[PDB]
C-alpha cells in the first residue's frame, strides 16, 4: 500500500482507539517480521565453500562499490550503490 511508518502508525492507533481491539500490529512488530524476510537471516552453507566469497550468513545490504578506492588520488567516483551478496540473496529468495 506504499504507506510510510508515521502514516501506518496513524492508522494503527486510530483503528485501535476506535475499535478497542488491536487489529493492526505496532511498528516494532513489523521491523521484527521484516528481519525475517530480507537476506542475512537464515543459516546456510555451501559445499565446497565458495572461492573468494565470505562464509558469514548474516550479510545484509552491502555497499555496492565493494570497497572501491575513493580518494583524491584514484579515478574519481561518486556513484552511490547498494547491493546484496549474491549467495545470501539467492538463499533468501529460495526460503
Amino acid at each position: 500500500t506504499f504507506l510510510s511508518c508515521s502514516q501506518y502508525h496513524k492508522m494503527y492507533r486510530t483503528v485501535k482507539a476506535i475499535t478497542g481491539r488491536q487489529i493492526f500490529q505496532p511498528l516494532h512488530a513489523l521491523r521484527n517480521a521484516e528481519k525475517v524476510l530480507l537476506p542475512g537471516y537464515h543459516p546456510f552453507e555451501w559445499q565446497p565453500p565458495l572461492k573468494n566469497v565470505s562464509s558469514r550468513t548474516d550479510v545484509g545490504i552491502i555497499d555496492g562499490l565493494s570497497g572501491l578506492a575513493s580518494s583524491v588520488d584514484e579515478y574519481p567516483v561518486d556513484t552511490i550503490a547498494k547491493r546484496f551478496r549474491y549467495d545470501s540473496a539467492l538463499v533468501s529468495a529460495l526460503m
Binding site: 573468494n52 566469497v53 565470505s54 550479510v59 552491502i62 562499490l65 565493494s66 570497497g67 572501491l68 578506492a69 580518494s71 583524491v72 588520488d73 584514484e74 579515478y75 574519481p76 551478496r85
Partner: protein, 346 residues
C-alpha cells in the same frame, strides 16, 4: 609559467583522469581513452595536436604487425630513447582489472605527417612484477648497458585474501625494486631495507645512472612521506647491483606531474599535500652531477576555477609544457564535463 585555457573538439569525452601523453620527435600522442576503442579510431592512440589553443584528437593507425593494446588508465610510461620508443607497464583496463603486459610504442612509418605506430608487446620471466598501477618505471644507463628500474605502486589484494565484500579494495605493493632487461625481457626483484613502506603515485626521475623517487601517497598508513630516495644501479659484467639512500629536502606530494624544462632541470607541478590539500606551489628539481637541488618557482598564476575545485589530472606534452584538466561545474550544470588547460614551463 604562463597558464592558458584550451578549447577542445567534438571527442572531448575521450579524455579522462589517468591518461597518457607520449611524445615522438616533437609531436604528441594521446593514449588511454575512456571506454574500449570505438569504431572511429580502433586504437585509442591519437594525434594530440594543439594549435591556437585548440586541440584536435585525431586518429592514428598502427603497423601491420603491431598489437592492439587496451586503453590503460594508470600505466607506467618511460621514454626509452635507445630507435626512440616508449615503454608501457601495468594499468587499469576499461574492465577495471590490472595488466602485467609490457608494450613498446615505436614509429614504423611517418609520411605526410601520417604516423604509423608499432605497438609490439614483450612479456617477462623470472621475478615478474605483480600487476599494479600508479607505479613508475624508468630506464637507467651504466657501462654502456642499460636496464629498467621499477618501484611498485598499489595493486589489488592477492588471489587468496581477496573477498567480494571488499573486491575493489587496494593495497600498496611490497617496496621491492625490479630490474628489467628489455632485450630478453628478464626481471629481477631486489629487497632494499632502507625502503620500508609501500608507495604509489610518486614521482621518479632518471639521471643516467640513478633514480630519484620523491613524493608518493602511502596507503599502508595514509600519509605522504616527504623523504626522497636515490637509487644507484651498477651494471657489472655478471649480476647487476642496486643501492638506496634517503636524502633530505624531499617533498610530501602525490599525483604530481613532472617534466624537463632545460637539460637536467625538471619542474614538478601540482599534486596533493593532504586528502584535501590541492597543491599549488611548483618545484624545480635542479639536477647535478651527484646532488639534487630542490627549489621552487613563483607558484604559477592559478585562475579562480582552479582554486575552487578539488582535483585535477594531466601530464607533460614533452617540451616543458604541462597539460591539466579539471572537472566541470555541478551547480553550473551547463558545463562540458571537463575544463582543460595547457601551461608552458618555458
Amino acid at each position: 609559467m604562463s597558464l592558458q585555457m584550451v578549447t577542445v573538439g567534438h571527442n572531448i569525452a575521450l579524455i579522462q583522469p589517468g591518461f597518457s601523453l607520449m611524445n615522438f620527435d616533437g609531436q604528441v600522442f594521446f593514449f588511454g581513452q575512456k571506454g574500449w576503442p570505438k569504431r572511429s579510431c580502433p586504437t585509442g592512440v591519437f594525434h594530440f595536436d594543439i594549435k591556437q589553443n585548440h586541440l584536435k584528437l585525431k586518429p592514428a593507425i598502427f603497423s601491420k604487425d603491431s598489437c592492439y593494446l587496451p586503453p590503460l588508465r594508470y600505466p607506467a610510461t618511460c621514454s626509452y630513447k635507445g630507435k626512440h620508443q616508449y615503454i608501457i607497464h601495468g594499468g587499469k583496463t576499461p574492465n577495471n582489472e590490472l595488466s602485467d603486459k609490457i608494450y613498446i610504442m615505436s614509429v614504423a612509418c611517418k609520411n605526410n605527417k601520417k604516423v604509423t605506430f608499432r605497438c609490439t608487446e614483450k612479456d617477462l620471466v623470472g621475478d615478474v612484477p605483480e600487476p599494479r598501477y600508479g607505479h613508475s618505471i624508468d630506464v637507467v644507463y651504466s657501462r654502456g648497458k642499460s636496464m629498467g628500474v621499477l618501484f611498485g605502486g598499489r595493486s589489488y589484494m592477492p588471489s587468496t585474501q581477496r573477498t567480494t565484500e571488499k573486491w575493489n579494495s587496494v593495497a600498496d605493493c611490497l617496496p621491492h625494486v625490479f630490474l628489467i632487461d628489455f632485450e630478453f625481457g628478464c626481471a629481477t626483484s631486489y629487497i632494499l631495507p632502507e625502503l620500508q613502506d609501500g608507495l604509489s603515485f610518486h614521482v621518479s626521475i632518471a639521471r643516467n645512472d640513478t633514480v630519484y623517487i620523491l613524493g608518493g601517497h602511502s596507503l599502508a598508513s595514509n600519509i605522504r612521506p616527504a623523504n626522497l630516495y636515490r637509487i644507484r644501479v651498477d651494471l657489472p659484467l655478471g649480476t647487476p647491483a642496486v643501492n638506496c639512500t634517503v636524502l633530505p629536502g624531499g617533498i610530501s606530494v602525490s599525483s604530481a606531474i613532472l617534466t624537463q624544462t632545460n637539460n637536467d632541470e625538471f619542474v614538478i607541478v601540482g599534486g596533493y599535500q593532504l586528502e584535501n590539500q590541492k597543491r599549488m606551489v611548483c618545484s624545480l628539481v635542479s639536477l647535478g652531477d651527484n646532488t639534487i637541488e630542490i627549489s621552487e618557482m613563483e607558484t604559477p598564476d592559478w585562475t579562480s576555477d582552479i582554486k575552487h575545485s578539488k582535483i585535477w589530472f594531466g601530464s607533460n606534452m614533452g617540451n616543458g609544457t604541462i597539460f591539466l584538466g579539471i572537472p566541470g561545474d555541478n551547480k553550473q550544470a551547463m558545463s562540458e564535463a571537463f575544463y582543460f588547460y595547457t601551461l608552458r614551463c618555458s
